[PDB]
Ligand binder design. Structure first.
Ligand SMILES: CN1CCN(S(=O)(=O)c2ccc(C(N)=O)cc2)CC1
Ligand SMILES: CN1CCN(S(=O)(=O)c2ccc(C(N)=O)cc2)CC1
Lengths: 123, 120
């Protein structure tokens, strides 16, 4: 009687191939699931294109997308909880900065490095 | 003053101009912008275009759920229930986009500064 509904994931947006933070809201059939993204958008995503990352693991190559940093590549070096929110410490140049969960995304090539271990397809 | 005017204004992290409204004159040549995507910040007059609408024949960029930064040319405008749509020609087709879905790259927006830039 298990369901993926309410699991926090990082799921592919079809138009650009980047993986964004969201939650599963329904098993919709055809191995697709309804995704509510943190940025407020909803669509159906294939199980194979959903990463069960919560959080994205340490040492992972990621991309920062915040108000001040537009698609800046970096490496996850830390996780922090603050008032029920997850933050990532992302090392770029030789400097570490904190980013909210919503602000960390994966390029297609970055997400493919996690798919074998974290991808929902096999499950 | 320029308060309440619909504009196209530069987002500093990527150089793209996005649709919004001037909500306050903040002095030192800066304006508070409410962007149609719900973000607010302060923007210099030099980075604000008084386009409403963006003129016919302008090269623009479409950004929708299905089309991720796809360049084309404005060939039409229309009103549907009080909302503006742009007709963008690209790859042999014209399609209608809501105002919020039409943005300008720095190069596309730079071209419009002399005629439309709040400036100075
Ligand atoms: C006026 N707009 C311009 C764009 N910016 S942003 O900070 O670069 C951004 C924010 C959100 C998303 C997203 N939903 O994927 C993409 C980009 C917000 C303010
Ligand atoms: C999960 N997200 C991934 C990004 N997509 S989007 O459709 O490409 C988009 C939407 C809005 C803005 C923006 N505010 O500038 C930027 C990009 C929405 C759904």
């Amino acid at each position: 009687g298990n369901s993926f509904v309410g699991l926090r994931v990082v799921a592919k947006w079809s138009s650009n191939g980047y993986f964004y933070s969201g939650k599963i809201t329904r098993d919709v059939g055809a191995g697709k699931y309804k995704l509510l993204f943190d940025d407020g958008y909803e669509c159906d995503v294939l199980g194979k294109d959903i990463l069960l990352c919560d959080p994205i693991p340490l040492d992972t190559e990621v991309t920062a997308l915040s108000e001040d940093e537009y698609f800046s590549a970096g490496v996850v070096k830390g996780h922090r909880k603050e008032s029920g929110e997850l933050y990532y410490s992302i090392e770029k140049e030789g400097q570490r900065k904190w980013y909210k969960r919503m602000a960390v995304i994966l390029s297609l090539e970055q997400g493919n490095r996690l798919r074998e271990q974290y991808g929902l397809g096999p499950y």
